[PDB]
Amino acid sequence: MFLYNLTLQRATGISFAIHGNFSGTKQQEIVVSRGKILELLRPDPNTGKVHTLLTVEVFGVIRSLMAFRLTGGTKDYIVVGSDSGRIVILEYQPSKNMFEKIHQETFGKSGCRRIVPGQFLAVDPKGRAVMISAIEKQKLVYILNRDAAARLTISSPLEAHKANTLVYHVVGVDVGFENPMFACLEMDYEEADNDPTGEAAANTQQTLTFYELDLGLNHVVRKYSEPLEEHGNFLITVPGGSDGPSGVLICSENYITYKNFGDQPDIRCPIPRRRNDLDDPERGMIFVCSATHKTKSMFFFLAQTEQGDIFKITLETDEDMVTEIRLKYFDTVPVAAAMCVLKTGFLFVASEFGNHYLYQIAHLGDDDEEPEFSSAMPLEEGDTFFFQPRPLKNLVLVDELDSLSPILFCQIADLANEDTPQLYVACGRGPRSSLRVLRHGLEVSEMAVSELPGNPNAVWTVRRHIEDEFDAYIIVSFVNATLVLSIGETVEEVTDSGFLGTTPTLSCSLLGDDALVQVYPDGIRHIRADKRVNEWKTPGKKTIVKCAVNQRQVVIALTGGELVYFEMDPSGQLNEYTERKEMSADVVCMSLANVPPGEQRSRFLAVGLVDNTVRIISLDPSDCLQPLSMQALPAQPESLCIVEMGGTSIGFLYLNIGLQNGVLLRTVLDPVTGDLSDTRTRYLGSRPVKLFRVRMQGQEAVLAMSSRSWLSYSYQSRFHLTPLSYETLEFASGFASEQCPEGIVAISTNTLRILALEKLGAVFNQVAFPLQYTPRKFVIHPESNNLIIIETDHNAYTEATKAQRKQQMAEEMVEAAELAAEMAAAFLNENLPESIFGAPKAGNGQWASVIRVMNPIQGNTLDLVQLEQNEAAFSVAVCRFSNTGEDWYVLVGVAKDLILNPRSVAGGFVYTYKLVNNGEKLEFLHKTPVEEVPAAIAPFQGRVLIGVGKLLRVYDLGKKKLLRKCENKHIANYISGIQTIGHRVIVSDVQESFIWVRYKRNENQLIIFADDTYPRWVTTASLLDYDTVAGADKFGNICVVRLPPNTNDEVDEDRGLLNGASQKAEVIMNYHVGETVLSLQKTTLIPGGSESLVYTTLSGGIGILVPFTSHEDHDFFQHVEMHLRSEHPPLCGRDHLSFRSYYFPVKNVIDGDLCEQFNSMEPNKQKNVSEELDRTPPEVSKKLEDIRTRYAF
């Protein structure tokens, strides 16, 4: 069982973001870390849209990220600390569009060790040193320098080690050009492990220590060490030297503190709390992220609290020292992992979950009468400041980046009756969670739709003047007549364009600067600028069949295979060429290449015959109409188009052919010689395919329409072919106007419409449907196609508990003090939207939960059930109990009073509902109590399997409750998932891996007959066949366990092997994905594809695991992988074989993410690798692209 791994959708969650001048110019970029991927994002200042410039997969865990400038340096370097045991320094190369590793220095073993550095990374603000440290007892400083050829040089590491010592954060201090300082949030656990009473743990305290790098003596000395009052959680570098004082801001729970070494006294400001807050009063408040904005004038900090509140922080300096901290409510934004104030007045918030946002800073917070808190404001003993949150004032949302993080559940199904399946995914945390429906293809938005009198044949768009940016006319053709339109704000038929409305037109365009051509079967009509008209009548009985028109040259084909072309001579009047060219067979269709910008006219004319062969013809005056190159074909062709794609130099010239079969052929065409080279066929749709040239991103894409439209374009200098997610179209062409600059005019039958493709380069388009809490599971009702979703949150209030809590507070406002009730009235009245102001947090053991019945197409809530305040839903089923008949029931397992640390539960219930009204409604039937949380429910042969804790039970429906039969009690730990096939049950223990249990009817008992030999923390499972189970862990790896061929499940209930079952299952595949998988499902993704195993990670990624069908493929892909592991090693100093073998050695998988980085290697390296495979680099790219094509997208 040899599998191949592919990534369809890369991870989208963001761990780190740094902003800098990475390209080396005026423009500012962001470098985001998506855990396993490093991306370069450049946001447009005028447009405001974020563009992804680079995305490289590093095969490691990126644990820290910083940006670094040398002294007097324009470009910034990226310093990455990872789990590789080395520190790398990277430089972005814009000419090449790739990161370039500049330095790689090795200090330790790999993995996320406790004492090997890599976790914290701090750079000196001038750029002279960098400091990398582990969680405890290991720090290392590297000195960075520039040589005389302006290249970066690195030194040997200087070490600062301190035993028994924990580091919470490390930041580099801005001392001007003195010796570099680094500040730390240290703690010493040495005393605490030697006090049996436990006092020394209680009263040991965190210190701030300053390390000084003495550049004279080449060694690092631990200078200053001062205990803190409470525990901070991170530090902020205060800009210093010439600009501002040099110190550190320590953020701690409920406080922000300025400290510096010297005579400066410590300055503390409480953090403002929200006025009339619904939270638990015991909970403190911390800051989660910060950002500094340094102008040349002044500076401030933007720090966000747990609840999403962003404050401005400004320091007031009385000469050398600072005297108070001033703290002002700025706005409320979703909780972030990173914020980046770009220099062009934007703020980039990377949310820790969900979508990311790019705001524009309208106003700094300096007006509008808003109270400003301060450390100097004298405040009474217990109580603190309060503020009132509000909608956005300082920020305007400009762009939003879709993120699937975290995919909590997924199901690949066809619920919308179009042939391709869609992916139904549940993701997001709390209020911002949502059900998303992902489809394969570009989002298509339509501007206008309008009726047409009859079925229209073809549609063209005509520009008045070649210089004009926007189009003037729209031409539509019918069987008998042509209808012509003039665009604008309003599009209405105009009759004075000079076009003929009597006979169906075959093409309309603009030769020359202003001349206009209409070619119809009767003849060819030429319209000057001054509107005098010329006619060219066809000679003889024969009439025009097909025409191909350029900006300066026109070719027509009369009946019988006669070719005629007219050239635009400098008189401006189309002159016929002296001699016509006979051809052997009649011509179906032909195309003429777009004229190059400088050149006078296009050399090559591609004509397609009825003999399934296409012949290239030459238009040079030396040899006008003389054959050059012919290719044969499987089926007769419908349409050709010759385009230039990939140009930024000049793009390389391609011939696209379409056939009756439905397959699209994209073929190399040599510009100077005209020799077609390699044709990579693709099968799209079921009807004849028709090709039309369009313009996207100022680039010349092609649109091929079959049963479903398919757009072929180049993105990030890489070709793409993705189908428009929109209904079939008869004909299309390019369109440009003030309302839409780059669009498509398409006529489907008896209609006309204008289409704009807003997002390109994507793999999935999505729609999102809001939920209230985090979705745990859902099920599909088979008949109705609805979804039954359970949502749950810890620390949460349900709706009713929130209303009672609020009423209690409004009573308390009156009990405090005659005007107050008026305020309490407003307090009961105003509602802050919970998806943008957070959800109030309730405490440990507080659980809000909801059942919801939902229409997948429309998105509306068909029914909603709200549960009691400490009842938490964990499982759901929909099933027909066979005894009661055909009547759907929904079972929901609920835990009552669950604490997580340490674990305890008061009990569980199973709620039964019936599904009435064809799935619209739930009718409560009964509630049956179980003694531990029912974590898995599975329908099983007319009855249900419920695992309550470690007990596996069969339940049947009774009228007063569910009824228990044949419970098993030998599963080792908590049951987390149950799968069935036949009379076999596969139970996923929380840490004991898979257990195979057989249910024998006529004894009424459940018998363990097999299991696994490894401890595994299983998150999900899926059955590949009758003997195989695929599983996934919390630690990020997938396994495939098979059952050996001899095993019988005829076991009758002592011995056991190894304290377990007597029969053991063999592990036949291990693979470390890198990110936690929560959903495996075996499915087919495209129509006419093969099956695959699809998995969706927590971070938002989607991949497939596809099995090889031959040994020759398997040997090819294994050799490609083994070459690339040495030729093109991972960008952060990690080993690939070691990465994929993180917990268990890699077995039977070829990493295809590594293999498809063939196309990113340098051409000498591609040629060198492809020598030993005995293939040319086009053949290697073709084989890498064939397996992706026949399984996936």
Binding site: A448, T490, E492, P741
Partner: peptide, 13 residues
């Protein structure tokens, strides 16, 4: 006489 207006627009200054 068919006459219509664009329901949606796509622009940014």
């Amino acid at each position: 006489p068919i006459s219509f207006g664009f329901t949606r627009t796509s622009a940014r200054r």
